[PDB]
Amino acid sequence: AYTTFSQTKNDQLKEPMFFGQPVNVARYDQQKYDIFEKLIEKQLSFFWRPEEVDVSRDRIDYQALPEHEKHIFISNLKYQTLLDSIQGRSPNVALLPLISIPELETWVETWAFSETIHSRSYTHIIRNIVNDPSVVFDDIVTNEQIQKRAEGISSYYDELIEMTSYWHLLGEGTHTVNGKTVTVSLRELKKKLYLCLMSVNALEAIRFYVSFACSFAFAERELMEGNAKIIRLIARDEALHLTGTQHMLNLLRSGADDPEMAEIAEECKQECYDLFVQAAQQEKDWADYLFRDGSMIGLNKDILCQYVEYITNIRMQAVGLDLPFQTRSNPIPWINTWLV
Amino acid sequence: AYTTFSQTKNDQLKEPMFFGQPVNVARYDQQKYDIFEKLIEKQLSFFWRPEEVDVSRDRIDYQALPEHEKHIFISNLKYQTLLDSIQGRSPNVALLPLISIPELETWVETWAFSETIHSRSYTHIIRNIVNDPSVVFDDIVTNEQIQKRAEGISSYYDELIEMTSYWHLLGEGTHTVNGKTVTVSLRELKKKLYLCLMSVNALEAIRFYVSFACSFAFAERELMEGNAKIIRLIARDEALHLTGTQHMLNLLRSGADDPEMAEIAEECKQECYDLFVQAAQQEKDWADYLFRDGSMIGLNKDILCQYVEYITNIRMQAVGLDLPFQTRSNPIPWINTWLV
Fold it and tell me: How many folded domains does chain B comprise?
């Protein structure tokens, strides 16, 4: 059911963002929702190359950091490296086969692409501060702590990809495959997609902002400033990334795109609220892992866990969900001089 | 069978290019094949924005052209727009799910991204020379001549996509699906990938080069100098794209990567040869369509067909195929003033 060039001439302005007729002609003269065209323009104007930033002195700072501070820094770096590895390929394999409007298709591709630049910058850093980069890279797949957060995020993607395959192959309805029943509902598929987008929004809007806190905490003490210059640029991109998923989620919930989606939005309010809250809990448990051997100047478990709450509330707010925490303020206001 | 992050730690330097374990950690500190990393660096360093180029003059030049000359130009531009629409999404949708080494994965996403820039540049040209961009974009899908090239190209992608879905979902061997018996063969899938890759090489190495000839023939007359600056940047990019697929085809048939591929390469020798020869013939019938109402200074049906033959020999030899045409010197040597 999927074609790289649908032969039916259609009005792209009348197609839903998802599940419509695959995009055939790529035009940017007109747009259904010009937010995506703006995101593309913005992202392109922000184009940067990691190689350009000098992270040579960071090598010295890193070597001088006491054990626990190295731990804090490196664990954080490994996590980011993993999240962007997933973010690099995923928007492409998972969303591309379902997009129905040119603007969104190109945005997804541009978004996925900037993530690869992020992954490259992580190599650029790791390469210049560690002696054997392989040590670091290997632990990213090994480390049970990181692994617990890896699956869960990849699960929402994997399920979507599998269901999408079936739907494209067998079409809707009940089917038989090697003597088993298989039910392909377009409603279930749309639900999986929504959930996945909630998860991705949590990933970029919450998880990544927690790591930015750690990186900037060091920069505040004038340490790891090469790394800081890079996180500064990555954070600038991340803002665009989360804005994209916010608008997607909000267009879908308001039913201004596909009304079956607006229904799905409400039938999931709880499941969505739960995944967001679960994410925040994981991040708080991550803070434990990070500070197990001791804190550092400007940051500790309490400050970080409160930040997780503050940030989570603000994000859930933006996609019309209930705030799950009492926290009303940001404990590290200095992070704003680094952001955007 | 497809996962957004394979939890098992594998040595990525030992995996094949395709069908191995899905890449988890995106690293660039080490590579199995230096070529893909070099391409990524080059593509990144070539980064350009369509918008920056001034094409306001072209409107007048274009208006001043006789009907047959507008026909030549516009048909050429539509063809280019269609081809890159497919090239923007296809490598990501078709190839990404099969890649098992980091550097290749990133190259593919970069390549695809690069293609979306080309598509934007087409829109930028069209809306600056024509009145109602819609007439142009609409014709791209309804036009019988163009549709005759589109379906052939996309079929290679589409078939690979479909067979890939089966393999991921059901795995190898014979199966029962709604009664029908479906056979999923890994060797069969490998052949489709090789054929598809061979087709993409033809797309960028021959088809596009033929259109560059038309585009540049006008520049030689000092007309459409804006479109010319753009096509120049696009060609600089296209050179990287075909180099990419040549290396893939060559590594594959040399057996240096996967031994079973060297064997598939030998089995499909004739099929590949006919595929290339068919592409050249199709391009020759295109020149017929292009010049049906008359020719122009510096270019016509004969000259163009000669270039089709000249370029086809060279591309075919690069990927170990037989030369189907007479050997001759470059019929339009002036094109080198515009290339690379």
Answer: 1
Token readout for A178 is 């090697």
- CATH code, domain carrying A122: 1.10.620.20
| DSSP at A20 | S
Pairing, β A181-184 against β B173-177 = unpaired
DSSP SS3 for A296: strand
Strand ranges (E), chain A: 173-176, 181-184
Interchain CB contact of B97 with A (< 8 Å): yes
Instruction: Say if A138 is an interface residue toward chain B (CB within 8 Å).
Output: yes
DSSP B140-202: HHH-HHHHHHHHHHHHHHHHHHHHHHHHHHH-SEEEEETTEEEEE-HHHHHHHHHHHHHHHHH
A281 residue type, one letter: Q
CB contacts, 8 Å: B5 with chain A: 82, 85-86, 150-151, 153-154
Residue count of chain B: 340
Chain B nearest CA to A124, separation (Å): 8
- The encoded tokens of residue A3 equal 């074609």
Whole domain around residue A230: which residue ranges?
1-340
CA distance A232 to A227: 9
Catalytic center residues of A: 122
Method of determination?
X-ray
Q: What's the reported resolution, in angstroms, to a tenth?
A: 2.8
Output the six-digit token pair for A296.
Answer: 């550092």
d(CA B252, CA A137): 28
